[PDB]
């Protein structure tokens, strides 16, 4: 929802054993890209196979013979692959062990990666993975991926074959040791449906056009993110046939789920906030393109546990600290974001989250002023606002006099306000402590980071823990941040010569 | 379904349901339209404001602020209104302060000795009235106390008696 996808394409993830389309192009005459895949059966049986790959679009029309075809619009956009014997007839595959190489594809935008500094380039937005096998024998699964059965035994107590039973809710809930209300609380495919803030604009009528019919927001947009890994074909209940059944269950998603629900037991949280927090973390990390369980994630959970316990920190808060605020809710409540701003109507217009900017430095333009004032409605004093805003603008890289009505600005501000407030420190004071710790005031304005060049000045989490500790020490010693900073020479005291 | 069927039974003259409040069949059946709660007033003012927004579009003035229309629509009697004035009024009310007091205290000079104009303007603030109402009340009279023409003037005219007045 946050970007257009009307034009986009796919490229082969660069790998030394695969050759093919590595860059997107605005136009081509070729019906399909050609790909060649080098692979080896564990017998060191090594072969290469050609394959065809093509971007494909599909659309619908009514037989309204009176109007012209009026076709131009955003449209569903999909990827199709096809092997043919005609391109690989020589390979004579009868005896070869059936197992061969991985295949991977980036779904990618192509744009000036620096709208100023040119860089018109294709650039990824999603990644996906496949394994290819070749077996003239029409071999069995026990030949193809025998490891699966061992997995299903150890993790499901069953043969991989038993998945075909597991597809039904009864077998599923049984083997999982779960009751189906939990499952709908997981799937949101029934009444536990997602909800969206009315006051928020989206990048494209991806779902706004006439023929759009995906229920919006989708579970793969919210609440079902990690388990569906953003794939449009999300898992759902489906009407029965000799009992109720599940939409679609790749073993990949099955093992994701197997992990997920155990973690859910241990943390004791509803699925929506768990998924929310999890995605917030993994998407904040630039490295985890693959929605993978990783150390910073675990570390984040540790922090949440601790802070939730000590200060009753709501996971939404934590999530919107390390990532954007969420314009969504589960079926039953107002969205955290909209609650925070349109908490009540005090003006004519509700506050709304939009593209565009305003001259926050003075905002003499009535509308700009209105916007800024509504934002100042975020608890803090107007004067405080001006201490914060230049730092936010600078950290985000915006034009000095301007700010924009987007989550980035919002979240930055929210961090800077809320975090010290959790320690009862004024947002003003926070700047002082941050400089003391880092010689930077705007530190929390920045986005979280997990830089491999790990240094003390980088871990948000450690820094937060330090803020905690030192705050305790300060109050323990009956000190004051201003006094401390002055004594430490962080700021000069006002003096002048005298008679 | 029942009403939908009944409304098929003729009498095109009738103000059929969807001629009004056409949003109603458009509402989605869902868990939240069921479970979550809101003030009735919110809906009332919403639907009504929607109607008004359409009407101002019929005035070809959708470019105008709907609120702002109330800034000068003099009829009916209660119609002329000003949101910012109300906001100020209640704001200072919550502070337990009068605007006149605020301005009077904001003057650099001492209240016990400061310009007449400031006294004037402060007192006007103490009126609590909006500038719009002020202007309306300030308008000059449209009609002469009486009006006559040669017909009745030839027929002769009698004023009311007068000695009774004091």
């Amino acid at each position: 929802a946050e970007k257009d996808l009307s034009r986009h394409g796919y490229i082969v993830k660069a790998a030394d054993n695969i050759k093919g389309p590595t860059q997107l192009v605005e136009h081509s005459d070729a019906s399909y890209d050609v790909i060649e895949l080098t692979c080896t059966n564990q017998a060191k049986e090594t072969i290469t196979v050609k394959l065809r790959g093509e971007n494909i679009i599909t659309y619908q029309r009514t037989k309204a013979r009176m109007v012209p075809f009026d076709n131009s619009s955003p449209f569903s956009r999909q990827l199709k692959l096809t092997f043919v014997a005609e391109d690989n007839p020589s390979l004579g595959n009868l005896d070869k062990g059936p197992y061969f190489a991985n295949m991977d594809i980036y779904a990618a935008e192509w744009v000036r990666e620096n709208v100023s500094s040119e860089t018109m380039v294709s650039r990824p937005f999603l990644t996906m993975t496949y394994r290819i096998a070749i077996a003239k024998a029409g071999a069995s699964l026990e030949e193809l991926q025998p490891e699966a059965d061992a997995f299903f035994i150890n993790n499901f107590g069953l043969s991989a074959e038993d998945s075909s039973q597991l597809v039904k809710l009864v077998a599923f809930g049984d083997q999982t040791g779960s009751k189906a209300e939990e499952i709908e609380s997981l799937l949101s495919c029934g009444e536990n449906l997602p909800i969206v803030s009315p006051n928020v604009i989206f990048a494209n009528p991806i779902f706004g056009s006439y023929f759009n019919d995906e229920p919006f927001p989708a579970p793969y947009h919210f609440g079902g993110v990690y388990i569906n890994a953003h794939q449009r074909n999300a898992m759902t209940i489906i009407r029965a046939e000799g009992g109720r059944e599940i939409q679609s269950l790749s073993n990949f998603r099955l093992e994701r789920l197997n992990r997920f629900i155990r973690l859910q037991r241990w943390l004791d949280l509803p699925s929506h906030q768990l998924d929310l927090l999890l995605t917030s973390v993994m998407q904040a990390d630039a490295d985890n393109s693959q929605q993978e369980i990783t150390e910073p994630v675990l570390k984040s959970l540790g922090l949440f546990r601790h802070l939730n316990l000590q200060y009753k920190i709501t996971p939404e808060i934590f999530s919107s600290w390390l990532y954007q605020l969420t314009p969504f809710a589960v079926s039953g409540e107002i969205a955290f974001f909209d609650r925070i701003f349109n908490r009540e109507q005090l003006f004519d217009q509700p506050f709304i989250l939009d593209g565009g900017s305003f001259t926050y430095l003075d905002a003499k333009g009535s509308d700009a002023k209105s916007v800024k004032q509504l934002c100042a409605g975020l608890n803090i004093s107007a004067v405080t606002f001006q201490f914060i805003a230049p730092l936010v603008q600078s950290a985000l890289g915006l034009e000095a006099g301007t700010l924009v009505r987007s989550f980035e600005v919002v979240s930055s501000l929210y961090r800077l306000v809320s975090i010290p407030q959790t320690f009862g420190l004024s947002t003003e004071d926070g700047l002082i402590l941050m400089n003391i710790l880092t010689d930077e005031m705007g530190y929390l304005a920045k986005q979280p980071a997990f830089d491999d060049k790990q240094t003390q000045d980088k871990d948000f989490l450690s820094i937060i823990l330090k803020m905690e500790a030192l705050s305790a020490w300060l109050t323990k010693n009956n000190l004051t941040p201003a006094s401390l900073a002055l004594l430490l020479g962080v700021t000069r005291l006002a003096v002048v010569p005298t008679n | 379904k029942f009403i939908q069927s009944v409304e098929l039974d003729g009498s095109n003259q009738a103000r059929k349901l969807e001629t009004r409040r056409a949003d109603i069949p458009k509402l989605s059946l869902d868990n939240d339209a069921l479970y979550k709660e809101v003030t009735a007033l919110s809906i009332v003012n919403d639907v009504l404001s929607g109607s008004a927004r359409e009407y101002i579009d019929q005035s070809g003035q959708a470019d105008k602020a709907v609120n702002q229309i109330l800034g000068d629509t003099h009829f009916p009697f209660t119609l002329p209104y000003s949101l910012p004035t109300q906001q100020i009024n209640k704001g200072l009310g919550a502070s337990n302060i009068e605007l006149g007091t605020v301005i009077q205290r904001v003057d650099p000079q001492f209240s016990w000795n400061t310009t007449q104009e400031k006294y004037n303007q402060v007192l006007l603030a103490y009126t609590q009235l909006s500038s719009e109402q002020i202007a309306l009340l300030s308008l000059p009279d449209v009609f002469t106390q009486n009006f006559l023409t040669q017909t009745e003037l030839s027929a002769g005219y009698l004023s009311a008696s007068t000695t009774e007045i004091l």
Partner: peptide
């Protein structure tokens, strides 16, 4: 009574407007 039929009871739903339902409920 054995065990309550929870799983078997589990609800499936898709939202609609009243207009949608009215059309859908045609023969």
């Amino acid at each position: 009574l054995g065990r309550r039929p929870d799983v078997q009871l589990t609800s499936f739903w898709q939202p609609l407007t009243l207009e949608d339902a009215s059309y859908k409920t045609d023969s």
